[model samples]
Target: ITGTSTVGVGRGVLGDQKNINTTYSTYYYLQDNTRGNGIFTYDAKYRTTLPGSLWADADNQFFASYDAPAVDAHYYAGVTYDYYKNVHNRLSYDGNNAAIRSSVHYSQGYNNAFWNGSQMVYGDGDGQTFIPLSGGIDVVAHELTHAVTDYTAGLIYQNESGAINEAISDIFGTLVEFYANKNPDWEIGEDVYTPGISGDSLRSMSDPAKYGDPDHYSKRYTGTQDNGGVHINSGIINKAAYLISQGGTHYGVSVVGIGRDKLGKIFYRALTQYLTPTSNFSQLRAAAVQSATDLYGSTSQEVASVKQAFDAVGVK
Candidate 1:
């Protein structure tokens, strides 16, 4: 809906007050025209239908409990867009300034969020496993990064390729969290995981094994479950990413920390340039190495660190 761009005050799922970009038509709608083509947020109304009615408020002040998820979904989508444009020079998830869309409060007691091949969908958890997933900036970025992957690499979501896809989301998600500088860490979904269980997260990049995820290829899960262990085996790549950014020794191989910016650069280049739909872990290692070489030269420490990071994770 075309209308005057407006700013609205709202409290997020975590009770953090922030201003969201809304549009003033007949009613204030969560349509931000500030970034890309636009960033639109919707209310799922606790149902399974997609992109439910465009969230409308009479006063443009979103403080009600039900408005919390939409608030963060809209606000964080803008933040993630900023991170990509400012940090990577990417226009948007599609690199063409595609409009970003999200729907929140999807299904009662829904425990997860995902990119449904078109737009973002978030579940308001049962208040036990999670509160509202959009509340976590990393979670939001993770889902959006899936869109990035869909447009760029088009990695298949199964087996090794699927693991790489998942890890790429986690890797960029962590980078976006660090970019925001909001309680940043090598953890995923910590902000919106169990509310009562503190210091626990859905996954950890720095130490994936802490949550029973394999940090090395030797321990990679080969079962048929989880789409060939996409979520479980992603820990290996996530660990490699963590080592490339923060530096650490896994098993016996040691990596030199090249910092997050370089980590992002290497991976972004690899994802956008070298990776293909069916690329596996070894192929990913080659892509990262080539990307680092392209950016910092074959003899540069950046390339060597990329090699060592993959080696440390037993990617070969």
Candidate 2:
């Protein structure tokens, strides 16, 4: 009822009120790129301007090109926003009413998308192998969750902290999908890559090694992939959380842990209430169990289950 209606402007006396600066652009490689195309990227960054607040509809001028940019872009953006809102009561990215802006069609043939200091930016993809890159809901959730990490924990972006950063984002991102899918059985990044691709996702919650990366936890870690392999190694944490919740054949271990929703709550409390900008595994483990205990009581099966899940993943 708040939009798509011609409501009279109060006092200003306008026929239909509209905000200013609707669509924003994050032009990093805006100029001619290696591909020799204009490479205008679709900016997914958040903006406080009035136009940014307006959702795209037939009435808006921005819906002309690219077959309903506003419909897809803002629709997914709103989905990410509401996921946090309904699940954790999070208002916006910064836990306040912060204006979250996103830009679409960043650069031509761009193989990646990311959230800059202000907004989310995506490449249109070369179309040979990649697509919008932002089309994946988990990808969108991953980018938005970066804002959440930036807001809370401010978790270090390297080493274990970096992996934790990626893992936490992936967890919540997958949760966004799982919640949307409305299926107790969740799959990470089911729609991320094209059919030609042989992999499942950038990371996996149920099975980490399916993407052809190492399984299990190790601090030795790897570099030169996924920002210190944060995206890659995130499986360790994700699987641990998964095993803790669902319990499956653990690598060199056994089945153990509760439910996804229960585990999600433990992480939700840990991320928002316990961790900090510099939190590490040691700190995180303690804080998570502590938080879970606080939420479900010290003797609660869920609390013990969370601890068992953490151990089941090799954090011991």
Candidate 3:
């Protein structure tokens, strides 16, 4: 709804205090007009409905545990939006300043989050497997990146293409985490994956093998389950990305570290300019190589490192 834009403060899902953009009309709503048309967050109130209500607060300050997820969801959405605009030079996920919408507290004892074709949805975990998923910035970024993929590459969600899609989310998710500079690492969902557990996470880009995920293409899953192991086989590409950014040796193949900034520049270029809906691992190698070449020239070591990193992962 139409309202006056304002600033508010809140405590996140993990009890971290942060500032958020809000609107004051009738009641406080998690709507930020300062960035991208407006970033709006909603409260699902433990129901299965869609975008239940524009989150409302009386004092324009959110400190209660119940408001934690919405706080992070709204704040992280703006962060992700800023990443694209400032880093990638894109307006929003759609490159058109599309109003970002997110819903938290999606269901009772739920333990997941997703981009349901239009808006982002977060589940309050069963309390054993997870807490409010928005508690993790990487998780928030990962889900929003799905919308980015949908608008750009349109990568089909199955087989090799689907794995590429998942990897892109994980890669950017990790990058966004590092961008925020909040205990960044090459791990996915580390901050909010398991509150009870300390070191374990949803997945590890540095060593996907730690969680039975394939670090090399040779070990990729070929089964039909999990939409052709979209989440499972993403490890191969995730490993490739980690190798590009940090550089390492695997199976005796060595890669020159290109650093995270260069890694993001190359991959973002490839995602926006080179990748196709049916691109496989081999095509990914070509795209990365081309992207690096485009940014740093054909003879640049950036291109060579891209080739080496993909080859190290057995991606042809």
Candidate 4:
């Protein structure tokens, strides 16, 4: 009912919910009168959830979606879920069959979106102030992953731990996007934000050097804001993760490291059912190094790079 209109039906502004009989795709509408912007409506065929062969669900987070609402919601949820499980082998959000729920059109012309205790909420952009918040898979995954971080690792939302909390979301959020084969660009909230605007996203993976005017763990990052802007200072972790996994040049810059697909699983394991809220940089370094060693092998480059990046970040 948020973006529904009697006039823009022919255009792509609103989603086509009634005709959605697809088995897998989840449908969602856009502020721009659009269809196919939500979830993957074709479950048996198309899949937006990366590691595509894995998830399915209802429509909710469309902008960051693959198909329809019903199907994509589940699929997006599955992508996030399976990411934790496959990459780290942890169960769903609750480590059980925790029912995943997501709702969009959060507020009239709302610009921001987030995950409440039980479900994920989305806002249909004001078409001015902000674009659809759930438009990017990384964004959707980021918010949802926040829930995961809350449940596991329990990263203290202050200082480095807080930054780690924020970073963990972007780390996994962007990983989930790549896991789906989406473009690994640093620009976030792009599809949802109007094209004319600049610097629309909350953080940047490619250039941790830019964005977050706080300048990588500045004094401001420790101030108030959701867990102390865990989202803002998380750039370093995200950058570290990108450096650890992305494995290529980003934005014309030569890049190197382990594949995201590889590191995602290792980090996922270390955080879930392994690490703790008080886990410091040293513990994190050890846990990751151990996880890689256990999964890959001691002296393996997989393990080496895990430690390498920890050193790059000066993590204990």
TM-score of each: 0.98, 0.76, 0.98, 0.69
lDDT of 3: 0.92
Residue range with the least summed lDDT across 10 consecutive positions in model 3: 187-196
Candidate 1 residue 297 C-alpha distance from true site, Å: 0.8
Per-residue alpha-carbon lDDT of candidate 1 for residues 136-213, written as tens digits (9 for 90 to 100): 999999999999999999999999999999999999998999998978999999999999999999999999999999
Which of the two, 2 or 3, has more TM-score?
Answer: 3
lDDT of each: 0.95, 0.61, 0.92, 0.57
Query: Candidate 3: TM-score?
Result: 0.98
Model 1 global lDDT (CA atoms, 0 to 1): 0.95
Name the top lDDT candidate.
1
TM-score of 4: 0.69
Candidate 3 residue runs with Cα over 4 Å from true position: none
Separately for all candidates shown, the number of backbone clashes (residues 3 or more apart, or on different chains) is 0, 29, 0, 37
Q: Global CA lDDT of candidate 2, please? A: 0.61
Candidate 3 C-alpha lDDT tens digits along 1-316: 7899889998999889999999999888899999978899999999999989999999899999999999999999998999989999999899999999999999899999999988999999988889899999999999899899889988999999999999999999888989998778988987777788999998899999999999998899999999999999999999999999899998899999989999989989989999989999899899998899889999998998999988899998
